[PDB]
Coordinates of C-alpha atoms (C1' of nucleotides) and ligand atoms in Angstrom, one line a residue:
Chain Z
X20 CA -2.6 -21.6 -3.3
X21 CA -1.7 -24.8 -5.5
X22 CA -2.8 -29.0 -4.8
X23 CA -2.4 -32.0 -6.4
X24 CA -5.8 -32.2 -7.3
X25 CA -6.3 -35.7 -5.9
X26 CA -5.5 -35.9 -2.2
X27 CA -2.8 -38.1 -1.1
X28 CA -1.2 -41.8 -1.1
X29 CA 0.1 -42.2 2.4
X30 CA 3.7 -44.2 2.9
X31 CA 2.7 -46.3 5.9
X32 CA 6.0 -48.1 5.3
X33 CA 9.5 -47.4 4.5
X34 CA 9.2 -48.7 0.6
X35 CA 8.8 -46.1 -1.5
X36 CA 6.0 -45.8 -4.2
X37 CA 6.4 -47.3 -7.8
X38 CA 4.0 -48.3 -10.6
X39 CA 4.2 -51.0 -12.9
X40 CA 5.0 -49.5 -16.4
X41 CA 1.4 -48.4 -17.0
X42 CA 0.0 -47.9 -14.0
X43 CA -0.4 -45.3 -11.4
X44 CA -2.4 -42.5 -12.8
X45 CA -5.2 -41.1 -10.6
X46 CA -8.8 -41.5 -11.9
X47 CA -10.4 -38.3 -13.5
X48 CA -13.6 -37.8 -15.6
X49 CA -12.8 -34.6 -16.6
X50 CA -9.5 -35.8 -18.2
X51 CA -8.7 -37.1 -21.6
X52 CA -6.4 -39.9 -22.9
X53 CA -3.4 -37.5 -23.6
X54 CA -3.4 -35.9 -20.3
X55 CA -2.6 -39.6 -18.4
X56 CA 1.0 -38.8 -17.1
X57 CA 2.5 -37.2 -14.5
X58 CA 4.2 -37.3 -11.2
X59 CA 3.8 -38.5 -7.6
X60 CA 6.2 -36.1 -5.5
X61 CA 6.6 -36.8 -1.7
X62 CA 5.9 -34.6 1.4
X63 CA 6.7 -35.5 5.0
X64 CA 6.1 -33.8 8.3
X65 CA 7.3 -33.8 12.1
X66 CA 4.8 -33.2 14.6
X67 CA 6.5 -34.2 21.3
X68 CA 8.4 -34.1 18.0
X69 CA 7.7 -37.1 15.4
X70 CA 8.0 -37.6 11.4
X71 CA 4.5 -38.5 10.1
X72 CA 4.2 -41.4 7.2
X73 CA 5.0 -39.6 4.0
X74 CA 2.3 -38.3 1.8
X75 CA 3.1 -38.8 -2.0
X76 CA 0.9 -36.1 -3.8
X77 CA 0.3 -36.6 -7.8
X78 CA 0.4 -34.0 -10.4
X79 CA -0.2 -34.0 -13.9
X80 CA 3.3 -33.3 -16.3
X81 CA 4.0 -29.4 -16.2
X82 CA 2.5 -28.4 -13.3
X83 CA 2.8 -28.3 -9.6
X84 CA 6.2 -28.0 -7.6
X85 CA 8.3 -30.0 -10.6
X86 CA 6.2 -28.2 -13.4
X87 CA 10.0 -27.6 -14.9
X88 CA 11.0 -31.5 -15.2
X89 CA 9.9 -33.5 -18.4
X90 CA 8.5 -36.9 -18.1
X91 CA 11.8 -38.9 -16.8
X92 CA 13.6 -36.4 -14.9
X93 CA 15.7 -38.3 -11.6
X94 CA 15.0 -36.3 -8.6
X95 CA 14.2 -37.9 -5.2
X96 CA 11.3 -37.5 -4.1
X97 CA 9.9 -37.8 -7.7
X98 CA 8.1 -40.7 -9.7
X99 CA 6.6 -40.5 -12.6
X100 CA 4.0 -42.4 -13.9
X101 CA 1.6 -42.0 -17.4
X102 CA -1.1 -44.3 -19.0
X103 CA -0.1 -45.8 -22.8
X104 CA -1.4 -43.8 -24.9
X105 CA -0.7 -40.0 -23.1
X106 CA 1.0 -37.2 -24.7
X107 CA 4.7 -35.9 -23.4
X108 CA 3.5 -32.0 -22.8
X109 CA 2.7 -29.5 -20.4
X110 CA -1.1 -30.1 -18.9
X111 CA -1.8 -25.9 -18.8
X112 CA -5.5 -26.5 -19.3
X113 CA -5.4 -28.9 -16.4
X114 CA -3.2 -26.9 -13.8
X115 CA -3.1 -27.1 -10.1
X116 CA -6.4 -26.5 -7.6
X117 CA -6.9 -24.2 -5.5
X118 CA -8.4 -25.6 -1.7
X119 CA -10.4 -22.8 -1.3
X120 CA -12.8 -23.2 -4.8
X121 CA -11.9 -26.7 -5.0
X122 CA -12.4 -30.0 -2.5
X123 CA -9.8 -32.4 -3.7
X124 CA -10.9 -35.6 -5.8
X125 CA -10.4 -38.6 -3.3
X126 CA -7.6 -40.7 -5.5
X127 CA -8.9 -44.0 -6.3
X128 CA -6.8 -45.8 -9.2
X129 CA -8.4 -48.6 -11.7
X130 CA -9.2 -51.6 -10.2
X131 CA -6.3 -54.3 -10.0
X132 CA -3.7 -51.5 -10.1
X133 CA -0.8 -53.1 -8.1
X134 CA 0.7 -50.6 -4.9
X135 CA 3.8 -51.8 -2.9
X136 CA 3.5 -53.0 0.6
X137 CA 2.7 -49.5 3.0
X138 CA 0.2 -48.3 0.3
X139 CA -3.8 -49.0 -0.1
X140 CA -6.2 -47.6 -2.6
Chain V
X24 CA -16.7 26.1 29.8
X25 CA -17.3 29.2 31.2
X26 CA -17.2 29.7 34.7
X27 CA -16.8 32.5 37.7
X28 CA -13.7 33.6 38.5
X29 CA -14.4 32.8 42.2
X30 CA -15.2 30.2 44.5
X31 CA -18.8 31.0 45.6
X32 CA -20.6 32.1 48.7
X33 CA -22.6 29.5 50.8
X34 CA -25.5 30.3 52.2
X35 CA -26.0 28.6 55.4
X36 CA -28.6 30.8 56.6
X37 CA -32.4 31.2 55.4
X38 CA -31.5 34.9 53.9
X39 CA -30.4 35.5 50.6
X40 CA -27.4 37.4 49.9
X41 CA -27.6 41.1 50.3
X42 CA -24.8 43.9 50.6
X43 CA -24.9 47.3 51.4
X44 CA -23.8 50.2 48.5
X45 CA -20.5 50.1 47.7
X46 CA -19.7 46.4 49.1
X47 CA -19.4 42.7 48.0
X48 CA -17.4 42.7 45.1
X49 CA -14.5 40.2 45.2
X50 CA -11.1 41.1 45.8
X51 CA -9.0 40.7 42.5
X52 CA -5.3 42.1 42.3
X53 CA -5.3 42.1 38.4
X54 CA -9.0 44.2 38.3
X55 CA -8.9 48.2 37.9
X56 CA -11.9 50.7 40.0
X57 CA -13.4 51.0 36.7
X58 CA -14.4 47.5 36.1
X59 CA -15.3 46.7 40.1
X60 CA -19.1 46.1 39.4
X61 CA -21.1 43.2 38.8
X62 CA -23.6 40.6 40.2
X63 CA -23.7 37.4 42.3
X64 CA -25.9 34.7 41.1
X65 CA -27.3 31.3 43.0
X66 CA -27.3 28.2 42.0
X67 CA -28.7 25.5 44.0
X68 CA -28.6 21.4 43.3
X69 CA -30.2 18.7 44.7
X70 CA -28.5 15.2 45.2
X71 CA -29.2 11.6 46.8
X72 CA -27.5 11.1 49.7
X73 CA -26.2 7.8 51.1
X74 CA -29.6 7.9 52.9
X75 CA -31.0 7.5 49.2
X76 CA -33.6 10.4 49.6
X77 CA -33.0 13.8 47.5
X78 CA -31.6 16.4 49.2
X79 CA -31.1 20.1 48.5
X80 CA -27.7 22.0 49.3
X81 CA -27.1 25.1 51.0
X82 CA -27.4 27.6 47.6
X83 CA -23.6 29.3 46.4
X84 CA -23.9 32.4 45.1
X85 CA -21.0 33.4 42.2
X86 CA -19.9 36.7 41.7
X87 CA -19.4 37.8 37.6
X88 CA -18.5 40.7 36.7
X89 CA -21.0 43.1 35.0
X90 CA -21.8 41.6 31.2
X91 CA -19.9 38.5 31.8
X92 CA -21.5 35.2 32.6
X93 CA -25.3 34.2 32.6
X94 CA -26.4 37.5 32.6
X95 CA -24.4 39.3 30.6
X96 CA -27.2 41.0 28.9
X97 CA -28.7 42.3 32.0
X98 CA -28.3 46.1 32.4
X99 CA -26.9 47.0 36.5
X100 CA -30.0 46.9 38.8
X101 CA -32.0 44.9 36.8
X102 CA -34.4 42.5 39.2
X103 CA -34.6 39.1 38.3
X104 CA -34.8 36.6 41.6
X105 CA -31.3 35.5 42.5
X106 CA -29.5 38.0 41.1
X107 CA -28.4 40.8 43.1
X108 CA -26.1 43.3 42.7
X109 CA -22.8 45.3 43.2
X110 CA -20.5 47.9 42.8
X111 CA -17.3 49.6 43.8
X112 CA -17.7 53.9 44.4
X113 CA -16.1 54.5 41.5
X114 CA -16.7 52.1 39.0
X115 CA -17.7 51.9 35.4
X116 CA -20.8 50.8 34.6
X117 CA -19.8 48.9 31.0
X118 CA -19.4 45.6 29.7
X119 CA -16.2 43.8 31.2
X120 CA -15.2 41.4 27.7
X121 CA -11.9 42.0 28.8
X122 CA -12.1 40.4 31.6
X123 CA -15.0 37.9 30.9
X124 CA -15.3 34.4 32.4
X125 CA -13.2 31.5 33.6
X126 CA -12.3 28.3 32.0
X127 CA -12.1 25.7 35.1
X128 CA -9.6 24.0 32.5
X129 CA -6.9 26.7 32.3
X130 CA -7.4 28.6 35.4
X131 CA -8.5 28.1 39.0
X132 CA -10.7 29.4 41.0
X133 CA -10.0 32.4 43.2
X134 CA -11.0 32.1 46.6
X135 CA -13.1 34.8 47.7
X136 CA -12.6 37.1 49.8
X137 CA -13.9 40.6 50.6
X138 CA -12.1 43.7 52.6
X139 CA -11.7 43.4 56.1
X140 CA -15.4 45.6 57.4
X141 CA -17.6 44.4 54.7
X142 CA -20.9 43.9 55.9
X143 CA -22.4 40.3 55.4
X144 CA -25.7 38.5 56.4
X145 CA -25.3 36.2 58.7
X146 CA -25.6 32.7 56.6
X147 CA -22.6 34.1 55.5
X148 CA -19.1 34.2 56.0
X149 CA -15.7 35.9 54.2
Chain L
dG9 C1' -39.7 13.9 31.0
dG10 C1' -35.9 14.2 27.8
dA11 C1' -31.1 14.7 26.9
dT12 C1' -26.4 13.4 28.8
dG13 C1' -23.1 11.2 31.9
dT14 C1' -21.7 6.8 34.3
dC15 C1' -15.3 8.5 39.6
dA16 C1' -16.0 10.9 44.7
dC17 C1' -20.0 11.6 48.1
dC18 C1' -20.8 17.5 48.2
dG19 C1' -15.6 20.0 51.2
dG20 C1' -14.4 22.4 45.9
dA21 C1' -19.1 18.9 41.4
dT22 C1' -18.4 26.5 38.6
dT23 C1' -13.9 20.6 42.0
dG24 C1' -10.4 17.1 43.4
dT25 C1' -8.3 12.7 42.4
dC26 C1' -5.6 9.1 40.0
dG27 C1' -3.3 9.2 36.2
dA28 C1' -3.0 11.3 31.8
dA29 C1' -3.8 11.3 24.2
dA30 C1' -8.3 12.1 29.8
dG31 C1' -12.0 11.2 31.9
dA32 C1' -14.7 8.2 35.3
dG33 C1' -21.2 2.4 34.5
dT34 C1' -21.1 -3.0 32.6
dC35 C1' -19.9 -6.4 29.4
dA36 C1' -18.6 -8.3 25.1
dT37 C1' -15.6 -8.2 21.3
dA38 C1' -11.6 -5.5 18.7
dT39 C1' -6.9 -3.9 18.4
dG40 C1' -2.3 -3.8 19.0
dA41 C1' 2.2 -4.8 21.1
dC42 C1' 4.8 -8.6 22.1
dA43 C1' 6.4 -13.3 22.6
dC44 C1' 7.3 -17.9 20.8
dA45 C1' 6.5 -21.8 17.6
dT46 C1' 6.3 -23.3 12.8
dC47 C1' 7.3 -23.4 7.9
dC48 C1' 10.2 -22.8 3.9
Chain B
dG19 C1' 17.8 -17.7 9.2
dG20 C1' 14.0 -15.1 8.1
dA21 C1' 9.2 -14.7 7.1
dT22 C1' 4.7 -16.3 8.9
dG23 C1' 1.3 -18.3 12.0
dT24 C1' -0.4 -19.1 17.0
dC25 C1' -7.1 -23.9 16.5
dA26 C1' -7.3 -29.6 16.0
dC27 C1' -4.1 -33.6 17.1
dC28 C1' -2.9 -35.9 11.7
dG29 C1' -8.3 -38.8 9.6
dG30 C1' -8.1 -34.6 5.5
dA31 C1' -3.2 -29.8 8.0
dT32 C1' -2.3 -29.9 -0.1
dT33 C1' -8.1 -30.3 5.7
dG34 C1' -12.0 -29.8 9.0
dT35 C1' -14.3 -27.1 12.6
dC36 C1' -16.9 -23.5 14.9
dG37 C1' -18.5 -19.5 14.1
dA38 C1' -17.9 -15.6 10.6
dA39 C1' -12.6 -15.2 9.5
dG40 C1' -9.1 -17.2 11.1
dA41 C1' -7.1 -19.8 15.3
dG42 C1' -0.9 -17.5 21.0
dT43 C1' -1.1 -14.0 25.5
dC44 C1' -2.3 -9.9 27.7
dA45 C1' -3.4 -5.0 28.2
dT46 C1' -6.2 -1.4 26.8
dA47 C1' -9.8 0.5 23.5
dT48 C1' -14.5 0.6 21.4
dG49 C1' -19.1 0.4 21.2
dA50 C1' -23.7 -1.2 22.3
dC51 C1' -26.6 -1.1 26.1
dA52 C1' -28.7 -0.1 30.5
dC53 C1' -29.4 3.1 34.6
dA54 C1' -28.3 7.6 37.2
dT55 C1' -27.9 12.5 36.8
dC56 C1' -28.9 17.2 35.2
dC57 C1' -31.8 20.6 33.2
Ligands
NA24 NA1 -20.9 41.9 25.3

DNA sequence: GGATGTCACCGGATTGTCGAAAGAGTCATATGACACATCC
DNA sequence: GGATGTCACCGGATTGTCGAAGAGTCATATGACACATCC
């Protein structure tokens, strides 16, 4: 159907996620300066019954779930994130993956990027 | 599929079946004097017993009525082993299509019997 | 030997029986009705 | 509530695995394959 592309930060703590003012955007090759901003949006589950640690899930502006919200837009659930020099429009050419053509990219983030407490590159 | 309208005669004995002229037809309440002619045919078959060794069964001989059945091209009197024939005094000697065979499916077999005085070999029995 | 059926136990197998949309071996999947759990 | 899935054991379920795509139970139905029967 539709992923983020770049598997998952997992909330291993109650802090949510935030990103220093620059910071945040998953590493991808393929990807060009102006396409460096997006948004994390969170996912949780209950598995006898217990909530799991919150997945945040990242997804470039314009697509995904929140494809409707520009950069900015306060919804919980939703943080958004972007590299200086990116450019405020929808990502069409990058789009969503779909899990059955497409193994998602492992998200690794530049080295020195600062996480909060319950989060780990 | 097709099949005699009666059950058959065993034969218990060693002789094969045999009636004098003008007997052995099957009684049959919806059959006219005209179409009272016709032939019995055996048939034997041979199965393994419990004991596991083949074993052949006393032969039944099934009565069809003339051009009906597995000989319905055969002509009255026509000699061919295990066939034998009969007919009724008065009886027509035609093809009976109108009264042709049984289907086991639709229609059970009559039991046969003869009129009381008809003369049978003794591996035999009405 | 070469096709066709595979139940029972020759009574009547050219039937009777237990079930049945009739047809009847074994054994391994496939289907389909039905229930509950999960996901949105 | 009203569609949709029913596996594992949350690692990655927004996936991986074993077997062949999809994953519950349970009752028949089918079909390939061997033997017995019938002609
Ligand atoms: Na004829």
């Amino acid at each position: 159907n539709t992923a983020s592309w770049f598997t998952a930060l997992t909330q291993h703590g109650k802090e949510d996620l935030k990103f220093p003012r620059g910071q945040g955007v998953p590493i991808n090759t393929n990807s060009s300066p102006d396409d460096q901003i997006g948004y994390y949006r969170r996912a949780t589950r209950r598995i006898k019954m217990k909530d799991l640690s919150p997945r945040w899930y990242f997804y470039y502006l314009g697509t995904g779930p929140e494809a409707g919200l520009p950069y900015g837009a306060n919804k919980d659930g939703i943080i958004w994130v972007a590299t200086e020099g990116a450019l405020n429009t929808p990502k069409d050419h990058i789009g969503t993956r779909n899990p059955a053509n497409n193994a998602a990219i492992v998200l690794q983030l530049p080295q020195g990027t600062t996480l909060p407490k319950g989060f780990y590159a």
